[PDB]
Amino acid sequence: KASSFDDTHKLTVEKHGHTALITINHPPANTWDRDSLIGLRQLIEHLNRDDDIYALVVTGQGPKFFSAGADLNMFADGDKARAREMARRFGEAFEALRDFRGVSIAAINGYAMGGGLECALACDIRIAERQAQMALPEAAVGLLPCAGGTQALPWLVGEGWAKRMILCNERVDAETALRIGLVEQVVDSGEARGAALLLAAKVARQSPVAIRTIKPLIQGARERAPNTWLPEERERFVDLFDAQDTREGVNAFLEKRDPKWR
Amino acid sequence: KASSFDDTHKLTVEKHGHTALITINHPPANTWDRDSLIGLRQLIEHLNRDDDIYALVVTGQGPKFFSAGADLNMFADGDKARAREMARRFGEAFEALRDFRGVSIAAINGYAMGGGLECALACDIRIAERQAQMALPEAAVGLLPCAGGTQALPWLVGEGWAKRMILCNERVDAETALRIGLVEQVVDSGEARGAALLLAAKVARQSPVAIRTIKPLIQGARERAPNTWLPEERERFVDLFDAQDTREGVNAFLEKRDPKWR
Amino acid sequence: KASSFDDTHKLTVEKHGHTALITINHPPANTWDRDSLIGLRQLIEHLNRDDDIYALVVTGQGPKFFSAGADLNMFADGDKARAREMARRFGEAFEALRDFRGVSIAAINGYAMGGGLECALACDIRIAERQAQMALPEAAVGLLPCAGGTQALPWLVGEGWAKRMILCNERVDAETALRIGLVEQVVDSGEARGAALLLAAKVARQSPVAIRTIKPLIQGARERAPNTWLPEERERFVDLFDAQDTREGVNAFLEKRDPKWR
Amino acid sequence: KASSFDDTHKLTVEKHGHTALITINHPPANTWDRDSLIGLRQLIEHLNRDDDIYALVVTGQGPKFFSAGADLNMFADGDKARAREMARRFGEAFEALRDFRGVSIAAINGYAMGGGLECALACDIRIAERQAQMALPEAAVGLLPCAGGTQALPWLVGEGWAKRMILCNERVDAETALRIGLVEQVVDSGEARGAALLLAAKVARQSPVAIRTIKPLIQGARERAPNTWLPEERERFVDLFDAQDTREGVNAFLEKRDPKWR
Amino acid sequence: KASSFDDTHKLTVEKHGHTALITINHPPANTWDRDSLIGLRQLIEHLNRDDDIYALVVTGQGPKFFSAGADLNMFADGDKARAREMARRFGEAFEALRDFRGVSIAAINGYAMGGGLECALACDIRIAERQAQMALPEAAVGLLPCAGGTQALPWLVGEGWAKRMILCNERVDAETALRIGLVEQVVDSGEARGAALLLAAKVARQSPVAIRTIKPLIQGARERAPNTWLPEERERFVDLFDAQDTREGVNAFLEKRDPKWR
Amino acid sequence: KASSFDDTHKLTVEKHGHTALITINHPPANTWDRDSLIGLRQLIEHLNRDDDIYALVVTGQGPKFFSAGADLNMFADGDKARAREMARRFGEAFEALRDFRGVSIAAINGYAMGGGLECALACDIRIAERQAQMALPEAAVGLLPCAGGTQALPWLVGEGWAKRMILCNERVDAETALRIGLVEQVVDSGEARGAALLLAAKVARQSPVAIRTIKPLIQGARERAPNTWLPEERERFVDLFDAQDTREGVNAFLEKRDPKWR
């Protein structure tokens, strides 16, 4: 995946099966920068066009930190324009990732804070090593999360838990995050990458055309009320049926055999 | 309850006190069929009209399946017209149950998957035995949940967990479900029905007229933003107050005695 | 603050640092009254105007109850005109606290149900003693929660749990509440007030200008879908950057010193 | 319809063909009364139950007043309970009128002001005699339109014109209202009833089942954004097709003969 | 445009300058067909890709019919599947037209009824010859408009006028449509095509990049409340500003010369 | 008002009765500038505090220009920072005018283009001189309207007419504007101010408390769908009833005499 295009060397992409592995490679904290943000949005676009990929996994280079958030240089003083433009880039990149047609899993191999946590929130599922600590510390410096942190964090864990981290600037351990629902699963140190890939391989096992259409329905509630999507849900359901791939899944279950699709 | 109209033998309703008990009776997996869906909507309409019933309980016949989901014959390939119509049936049927004036409790005594889970999601409160496992496997066959699963599950348990079950096709034990908020309470095997009837009997102890009005307000957020409903809440409260029944519930508390209403 | 106006002696406010302490002092159950509701709304308005206060704490006088809910004298039969007016007073008072620019922490040192629970829900963060029990018992007497309870409780804990407390009239201990996400933290008896003050101290360490702007974004989901707020989230961020205060927060981290603002 | 039920003599119902004619009979100004409000809501429900009536027409007794608006008796000082209760009936009454399944035609034969204009707004279509003048004068007396005027008037004619009438208390002649979209058609004096009845006969020519389903869709925008209803529009369309009546209408045009349905 | 593409022979594409001319050519009433609808969607997508096109015009072949809507063979009885599929096609095609990045001008040279009217509505601007009559007659055959007509018509003309056309099956002349706002301009017979091309040329005089971004904003209200879109309007404005194309327009007004962009 | 407040020389405020007259005083074109934008927002705020003001009128100094739109220097190339900040002031300033509790009347005394038209749209009612021409030309310059013009214009005149002005860069005379609903009234040259003030004298005749509360209801549809506001409309009605001023207006009509309030 993404074998032919101008992509920052800071982001390295390795394709495993139908899963594309994206690693932030910025030393020493894997801090986000304008070059990586541009690459990510572009990468997501390229990966979406590719039909051979059904899942994506994001992890931080190095053991210590998945992502330290935004690099200090981006917010260097004396330029108002810079802050504006860069808020744009986080939103575009993270929303693109949030909009990846395939399943996205974030393997938190180190502590995720600020932009780093916002990136993980973009991914559909989060898997974290026990030692990682996740928090939004922007409030301490007088900046809000501008990557969608304000919306995303309450959504998963509720407003009260979201408020303590951003408002009170309190970091949470993996055990806490799993308890509040921030992270779906907890893993032993260093196992986040393998578990994510292992899970991403399971995603390859579901119909590609189906996964791509179902994911918007799940995330529809963000745009609009859930009851409104109900007519569309049946309609999308009818569209699937009008596919070669659809008939294969039902037949396979009927005959007790593994489904095979294109 | 539902003593005489043409009701499918597949669905049997027995009346205990003020609670109507509905059980799927389809062998061997209790899988849903077109006839059951029609009856369920009709049963809900008839139940709403009856004023002697304050609570509803649905369980799966036998100790192995609350519900197996949709029957394969119903989705047998590959006629597109049928598919459109069965999804329509699910939506109306599940929505009708979701909109029941009285409280709806689903007692999970068996495997509840696909359509069955969606049905359980339709119920206000879910009680599950420790052994039961719930998941949405429609993505594996290339079919989406058309019963409101795409909305209902993320609402109850959050997006991250919901995607994992549907997108990753990952079943959940009773313990995970209670932890993620999917199920309100966990019970020993075979005790779901007894627990369901027991919880339903307490609901009959609250004002009938109140219960029907209060349920819409709670489910208001799905149609629209919560804050929009605040004016309506006060207006519905006063509508409750201009009733003979409301004066009785308050009086009982003052005199420290059980309230008595029609 | 709030020592120079007419404020009911039932509500006592103590100013500690940048935290304002609000105590309900109505014996014996700390039940809400018209005099308290008016003071609360006025109090919140004065507190917002004050620039020395960054956090708010509310606690119930006495060990046994944080708040009893609404006073019985407040809902005596059979007058409807008042009932309409009292319900209005709750909404006005509760929304004012909910929209307090600073962080609001509710310390639950006693049983908090009905109106009292509704009050805690308005607060940003809730800390509860192990013994405290919280429920909405209005349905049993035929009254719906009029303080925004129908919206606030499902939002934090989800519909299934929320329906149980109101519809089924079931009380929850601190432990269940922490599990369901109703309370962010559980504390040893008598320590909630001290812990809340301590947590309130953490809020002082974050930039005031940031906290006030940031708080609306997190609560944006209630008024509208979260995705709608994303362009605003970037816009408000640029506004924060256009200040003398914001540059101090970022610069302090680079040189790893505590931020100093006014 | 309304042949054998307890209805106020102030309101008279005449059944012509498939249209039921309802006339306000309050002397001398045809002002609304509690008896009128109750009868209206009760009547509308009854009309909705009757399948023989596909259209509705509303007219004001006497040549001079279509609807005097609210009676002073209702808002007579100084009881507060009276006002809250009475606003409730207008909302219930008009909304029921607004929600009539068959078409509602408002024939303006006389002065329509205050509640009367609000009533006409509830009607789907308005036909007015050239002489009649309509405005909302409640602001002059310190009362807002509580019948939905604040929403309804702006929707039809725009914010600028609506504010002018309500905020500036400016009455409009038939010609001006037609120019602004307040009234779809203008008729010579005394021809409103005939034109409204005659327009109502045309509606019977359209499929009753189609008509009842289509009207909510048109009115969907008031509850939610237009685009949101698009999936459901297709769904209800297919629902029409699975009906004996649809096949006849579709068939009738092809033969070039008038459709015949029940 | 679109010469090296497979489009139904019925749809004719002519390129004048930056304006692409599409003519429906289905005899004898220019009624829509499945072959036509897919091409239309496809044609729009190809047009969106081409940067050489800034405007779009659609007119009906021959003087007599702009567009007759859906053919009966398309809706021929008795299969339900046929109708579900065609309803999807109208929505997809018309929504694609509505989403054309460039301005779409509808030139009404003939009868526009049913789908044809819906097609016109999908266009941004409508220019009609005095003789053309536009109505929705689907209700007379018992079928609602499935092309988004139920939403599109009340949006342009208001509910009251919209209801009469759909509910009462009333056709409107060019003058009446102009008065009600259905058509922006009325033209002499046979001048609709020339006028549309001439109008389309004027759009070329505004910045292409600006036009594509601005057009969604105007249509934002359909998705959401207008007030929600304002922060985004400011954001997109800044995005436009960060481009060479924007600097040219400002320069042109300053020196009083015509703006020149790619 | 603005008796003792810090305002730029460029806005002139004269108090006539209960109407505050605000005139843009920028030569030669009355073009908007950063200094005026701030004054506008502050002036609106101050006008809001004064209880002696019930109406607002905005006009441009000189006969020829109500407003030239935005000043060229503020949007001068090429700093991205300047443009972002300038867009921000337009929104704050215009929304403030939009949010004035008292009625706002725009007297179009001269050419109103770009910002000027957007400024006029913020006003509740627009009165224009026959010779005045209004258009949005920003698209010709490659800039979108950042003053909410994209939202405001289609709301008043509809999308179709809105698109031609902005997308086709076409200017409209008063007869055209009046016809399309852009302006409520057309006036003879030079009488706009007198007519505006005269119309502003009318609002003084209506209860001040009702006007301030009623105006948000009319404008509630912009934030959210209209049916949502109906419960609140009833609630606000009841709040007005709980006021001394409300009783006075109703009495005057009963006694057929002029209402008198403070």
Residue numbers in the entry:
A (entry chain D), B (entry chain F), C (entry chain E), D (entry chain C), E (entry chain A), F (entry chain B): 9 to 270
Reproduce text from the manuscript describing this model.
In P. aeruginosa, the gene PA0745 encodes a putative crotonase, named dspI, which has been shown to be responsible for the CDA biosynthesis. The structural studies confirmed the catalytic features of DspI as an enoyl-coenzyme A (CoA) hydratase that catalyzes the dehydration of 3-hydroxydecanoyl-CoA during CDA synthesis. DspI is a α/β protein composed of six perpendicular antiparallel β-strands surrounded by eleven α-helices. It can be divided into two domains: the N-terminal spiral domain (α1–α8 and β1–β6) and the C-terminal trimerization domain (α9-end).
The proteins were crystallized in two different space groups. The P31 form has six molecules and the P6322 form has only one molecule per asymmetric units. The atomic coordinates from the two space groups were refined at a resolution of 2.10 Å and 2.25 Å. In both crystal forms, the first eight residues have not been modeled because of the poor density in this region. The C-terminal segment (residue 252–272) is further missing in the P6322 form. Thus, the structure of the P31 form is used for most of the descriptions in this study, unless otherwise specified. Hexamer organizations could be generated by applying the symmetry operations in both crystal forms. The hexamer is a dimer of two stacked trimers and each subunit possesses the canonical crotonase fold. In DspI, the C-terminal residue 252–272 (average B factor 73.54 Å2) is more flexible than the remainder of the trimerization domain (average B factor 41.71 Å2). It protrudes away from its own subunit and covers the neighboring monomer within the same trimer.
